[PDB]
């Protein structure tokens, strides 16, 4: 009797709005351009499945179309915020050691999880054995770098699809976005680009968690009276 | 009993279908969010193929009209001894200052290329700019 | 009247620079490992330059320096490879320190 009203006012209400968390206010094509998000790798490194997202090549250096990045980033941030609102487990994954410390701190600060270390075979596909039969796996995996340190796709991209976990991923011009649920074409190398991504996801996740508490608290106060 | 056939469809289609068949008793937490706000492309595995024969990538080289002025300026006067500051988003190099003057004089009706290039150098010298010809 | 991406790209200093070979740029030291200076100069990738023998102690984190660029990204395709190998760093020559 009271559960249907709960799930309808709290879980189903945010899904009726195009931008319930106002994540479009977090970034702009200019803010992305200043963070050098449009800078891609050289044309010789281009992945075929990234051509639709490439604005062009400026002297053999691929330029990412920030107009598309802006639309893809909106979807990824919106999805990420909704999953944080629903109290999902969000796992950040990246093997880029230059940013391991930064990413681990961002995860702790937002109340989420990070895996920046060597990824051992079966963390996702064999989790019950490694952690226990009652282990809860992540509801969303966010890749700030989708390639491992031998320039191949991170194994967790394939294994996330195997475990039917949606993935958000920053995909540079040398990356493969086919299996990434919400890809975001953008520079994954420049410290300014990576720092920006961490701020946006950290802010989206933190805002959604605060929004969840406001709604719940209001729904309870009104319930008593 | 989620299917692990990651190369058959997408996580949404595989989840949506097993929910209909009753294999999955409950929908995963993300399913309703994906349905309401789906990605632009459904994440379906594709095998990347090398191009063969006459197939070419559709990426175009980015060029601008002013690049012709920049190519000539670097040939005639070389790179400026002034250092580029790519951190300043409004930085202007000697070449860009040359290009802007070159564009101004072109809009004043001058159409010759070799003449429009020599008058531009004089204007900058009058303004105090150092233009050391390479040769 | 919102500026488009095509406009930002046209008027960016990196676009206006043209080719990077033999271009003088200002860098900033952000990381140091022994005598290896990691210098950001506004591009996608940093460059790694050895500490100069003269006035080596003047080169510290945050010190702004002058570089002569050679390549924005070191990449090459080797025999049998399907894609280019990239070391994920730019090639540049450290000339000295920038002073006011």
């Amino acid at each position: 009797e009271d559960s249907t009203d709960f799930n309808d006012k709290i879980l189903n209400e945010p899904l009726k709005h195009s931008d319930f968390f106002n994540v479009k206010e977090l970034f702009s094509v200019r803010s992305l351009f200043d963070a050098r998000v449009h800078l891609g790798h050289k044309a010789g490194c281009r992945h075929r499945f990234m051509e639709p997202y490439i604005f062009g090549s400026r002297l053999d250096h691929d330029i990412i179309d920030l107009e598309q990045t802006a639309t893809h980033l909106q979807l990824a941030l919106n999805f990420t915020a909704h999953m944080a609102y629903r109290k999902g487990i969000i796992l950040f994954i990246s093997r880029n050691r230059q940013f391991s410390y930064l990413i681990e701190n961002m995860a702790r600060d937002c109340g989420e999880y990070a895996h920046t270390r060597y990824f051992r075979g079966g963390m996702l596909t064999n989790a019950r054995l490694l952690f226990g039969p009652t282990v809860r796996l992540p509801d969303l995996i966010i890749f700030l770098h989708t390639l491992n340190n031998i320039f191949e796709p991170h194994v967790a991209v394939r294994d996330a699809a195997k475990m039917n976990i949606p993935t958000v991923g920053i995909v540079d011009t040398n990356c493969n976005p086919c299996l990434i649920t919400y890809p975001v074409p953008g520079n994954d190398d420049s410290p300014l680009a990576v720092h920006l991504y961490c701020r946006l996801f950290q802010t989206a996740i933190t805002r959604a968690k605060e929004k969840r508490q406001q709604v719940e608290a209001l729904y309870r106060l009104q319930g008593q009276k | 009993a989620g299917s692990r056939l990651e190369t058959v469809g997408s996580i949404f289609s595989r989840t949506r279908d097993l929910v209909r068949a009753g294999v999955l008793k409950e929908k995963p937490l993300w399913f309703d969010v994906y349905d309401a706000f789906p990605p632009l492309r459904e994440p379906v595995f594709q095998r990347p193929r090398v191009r063969y024969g006459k197939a070419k990538a559709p990426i175009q080289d980015i060029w601008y009209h002013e690049d012709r002025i920049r190519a000539k300026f670097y040939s005639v006067y070389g790179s400026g001894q002034r250092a580029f500051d790519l951190f300043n988003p409004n930085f202007k190099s000697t070449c860009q200052r040359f290009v802007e003057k070159y564009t101004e004089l072109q809009k004043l009706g001058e159409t010759d290329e070799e003449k429009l290039f020599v008058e531009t150098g004089k204007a900058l010298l009058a303004e105090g700019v150092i233009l050391r010809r390479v040769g | 009247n919102v500026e488009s991406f095509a406009s930002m790209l046209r008027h960016s200093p990196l676009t206006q620079m043209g080719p990077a070979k033999d271009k003088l740029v200002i860098g900033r030291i952000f990381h140091i490992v022994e005598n290896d200076l990691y210098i950001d100069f506004g591009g996608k990738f940093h460059c790694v330059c050895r500490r100069p023998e003269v006035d080596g102690e003047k080169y510290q984190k945050g010190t702004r320096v002058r570089l002569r660029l050679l390549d924005l990204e070191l990449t090459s395709r080797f025999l049998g490879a399907t894609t280019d190998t990239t070391v994920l760093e730019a090639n540049a020559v450290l000339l000295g320190i920038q002073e006011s």
């Binding site: - | 175009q60 080289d61 060029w63 190519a71 | 095509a6």
Partner: peptide, 26 residues
């Protein structure tokens, strides 16, 4: 449409092809 869009043309910065020390000599 838009003036700031890239335009199609040939590489203006392309370097002239290198020549052997005997290029053009009998």
């Amino acid at each position: 449409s838009n003036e700031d869009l890239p335009i199609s043309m040939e590489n203006p910065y392309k370097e002239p092809l290198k020549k052997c020390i005997l290029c053009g000599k009998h």
